[PDB]
């Protein structure tokens, strides 16, 4: 049958313009509002994501949790030429949706999709994907994995001083221990950004944590 994710791709291909990442974002935002999917990203968190990318102008971005490719499109559209986005997706069929989504948008070149679990792929980045350090990390995958994958990104030495970690949904459904760690650690300087979830009528937020070097 035709899945929820395929319906989303299908709508984009009908109503967006190929090679125009912004129209892809509008179309997705428009569909999610029409079908009322509680998809965490909208213009609220989108503006903050855009701002974060603009301020720090990352050469290399790691995303955890590609899903349909909304976040990847939004971020990659602001990347400089020669900059890269690496997005990790554990679900093969989502990975394929994301691919097609990035390809429609004309961003297939900037973005590399890796299928597998974060804790398996992260330790391969330096050797297999010629990564030195990362400039930015967007966490949007399984919430119980935020804290262990942050610690794994430290252990592996993928963070340098000034590397930005940006984590969505830290309040809803919540990543309480992840927060406590980065806010408590001197290795991270932290800022909280608020986003009201108007479908659920409750406050959520993003956490931005800038790695300071090791303790
Ligand atoms: C240990 C993990 N590594 C990665 C890269 C993970 C991941 C999570 C996700 C979403 C789409 C959010 C997901 C996937 C399946 C069920 C629910 C939600 N995609 N990728 S989980
Ligand atoms: Cl998505
Ligand atoms: Na801190």
Salient structural properties:
215 residues, globular, binds sodium ion, 7 strands, binds ligand 6OZ, 44% helix, alpha/beta, 7-stranded mixed beta sheet, Rossmann fold, binds chloride ion, 10 helices
Number of strands: 7
> What is the highest CATH level, the class?
Alpha Beta
Structural class of the secondary elements? alpha/beta
Beta content: 15-25%
Shape: globular
State the CATH superfamily name: Vaccinia Virus protein VP39
Number of helical segments with 4 or more residues: 10
PDB class: transferase
Keywords: methyltransferase, neurotransmitter degradation, catechol, transferase
Assembly: monomeric
Entry title: Crystal Structure of COMT in complex with 2,4-dimethyl-5-[3-(2-phenylpropan-2-yl)-1H-pyrazol-5-yl]-1,3-thiazole
Question: Could you characterize what this model shows?
Answer:
The PDB classes it as transferase. The entry lists the keywords methyltransferase, transferase. It is a single chain. The chain has 215 residues and is of the alpha/beta class. It has one domain (1-215): Rossmann fold (3-Layer(aba) Sandwich). It is 44% helix and 24% strand. It is built from ten helices and seven strands. The chain has helices at 4-15, 21-35, 43-56, 70-76, 92-105, 118-121, 125-128, 146-155, 170-174, 176-184; strands spanning 60-64, 84-89, 111-115, 134-139, 159-168, 188-197, 202-211. The protein has a seven-stranded mixed sheet, with helices on both faces. α1 (4-15) crosses α2 (21-35), α1 (4-15) packs parallel to α5 (92-105) and α2 (21-35) crosses α5 (92-105). The longest helix is centred in the N-terminal third of the chain and has 15 residues, at 21-35. It starts with a helix and ends with a strand. The structure holds the ligand Cc1nc(C)c(-c2cc(C(C)(C)c3ccccc3)n[nH]2)s1, chloride ion and sodium ion (NA). Chloride ion is lined by residues 67-71.
């Amino acid at each position: 049958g035709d899945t929820k994710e395929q319906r989303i791709l299908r709508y984009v291909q009908q109503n967006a313009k190929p090679g125009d990442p912004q129209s892809v974002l509008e179309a997705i935002d428009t569909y999610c509002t029409q079908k009322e999917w509680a998809m965490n990203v909208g213009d609220a968190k989108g503006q903050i994501m855009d701002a974060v990318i603009r301020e720090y102008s990352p050469s290399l971005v790691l995303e955890l949790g590609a899903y349909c490719g909304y976040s990847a499109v939004r971020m990659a559209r602001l990347l400089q030429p020669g900059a890269r986005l690496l997005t990790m997706e554990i679900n093969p069929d989502c990975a394929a949706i994301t691919q097609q989504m990035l390809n429609f948008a004309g961003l297939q070149d900037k973005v590399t999709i890796l299928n597998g679990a974060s804790q398996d792929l992260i330790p391969q980045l330096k050797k297999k994907y010629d990564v030195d350090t990362l400039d930015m990390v967007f966490l949007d995958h399984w919430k119980d994995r935020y804290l262990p994958d942050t610690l794994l990104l430290e252990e592996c030495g993928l963070l340098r001083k000034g590397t930005v970690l940006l984590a969505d949904n830290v309040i809803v459904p919540g990543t309480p221990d992840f927060l406590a760690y980065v806010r408590g650690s001197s290795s991270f300087e932290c800022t909280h950004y608020s986003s009201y979830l108007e479908y659920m009528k409750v406050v959520d937020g993003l956490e931005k944590a800038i790695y300071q070097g090791p303790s």
